[PDB]
Amino acid sequence: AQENQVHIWAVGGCGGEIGSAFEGEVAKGLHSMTYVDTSRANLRDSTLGDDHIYIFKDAAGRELDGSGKKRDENAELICSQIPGILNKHTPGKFNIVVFSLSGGSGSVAGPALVANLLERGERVVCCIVASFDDERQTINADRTFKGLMAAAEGLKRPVIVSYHMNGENGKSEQDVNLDVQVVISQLCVLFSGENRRLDSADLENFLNHPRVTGLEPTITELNTFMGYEWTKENDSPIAFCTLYPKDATKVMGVSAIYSCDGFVPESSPIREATSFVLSTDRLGGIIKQIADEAKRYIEHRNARQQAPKVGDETVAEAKNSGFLLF
Ligand SMILES: Nc1nc2c(ncn2[C@@H]2O[C@H](COP(=O)(O)CP(=O)(O)OP(=O)(O)O)[C@@H](O)[C@H]2O)c(=O)[nH]1
What we know:
Layout (H helix, E strand, L loop, with lengths): L5 E6 H8 L3 H5 L4 E6 L15 E3 L19 H14 L5 E7 L5 H15 L2 E8 L4 H20 L5 E6 L7 H18 L9 H8 L12 E7 L12 E6 L13 E6 L10 E6 L3 H20 L9 H6 L9
Helix pairs in contact: 1-4, 3-4, 4-5, 5-8
Bound molecules: phosphomethylphosphonic acid guanylate ester.
């Protein structure tokens, strides 16, 4: 029982915790939100009912209890159950899939949701939080980013990603959550459809940029800025869409292949011009950073001292039940 203009998919524990701040917005009809996870451990106190919560189930129809950072543990079940999620929870006109590249559940059900929505022709913008605390997390993040790039190339439709880092500038998880919440709120205001000069076709061409730009469909990065100071550093984006308050001066000095304009209603919570910029020039740095983390963890792993193994003849001596040598 919520408005379906904007749909938020909280995938995994990181997605569910990030999106827990938008429950009141669902209560106010601003947007609809669906929790997708393999575990209910994080969702023990959510205000939203179980009709907005979907938990993956195994063959026996029993709800799972997390993947434990093992992407291949339940990948088949997730990929098989993704269409049922979209049937039960009707995807919104604009979808904001939030997931973490490091977990074993969000990093699988996130890209699966994105790929299924893109194949259905839906408009989806991802919010991504990547962590590099353990080697398994780094490998999962690298695999998920490669999979998203492959999905963008093979679906002939860009995968728009709002990339965030847990360890960037020494920020805690709370700061990253606040950043993702700001990005999601700005996207919800952009996708509300109440902007004066912004149409559905404009947003369709903005998200599916190669329709107008003609560039190769690849993974695209989304950056959000307030004011006009961002024109100096991102003067050459692929595309950008700006929402202005009342009697706000336009943005100049930006040379983009595609551009859109919108006007915020007088009652909307926007007081300065907000821009949504698409670019792929910073993807190389992200890939290099992920590869550096993977290389660091692999060089740490190769230095592991070999575990002291008991003799093979001792294992022959241990063929009795209980592995007692006597
Ligand atoms: N910035 C944030 N990072 C988070 C948050 N929750 C988890 N994480 C980070 O993400 C990593 C764990 O990934 P997830 O929480 O998505 C694990 P997942 O839910 O897929 O596994 P299960 O708990 O078995 O379902 C780990 O590095 C955490 O520090 C969060 O709310 N914010």
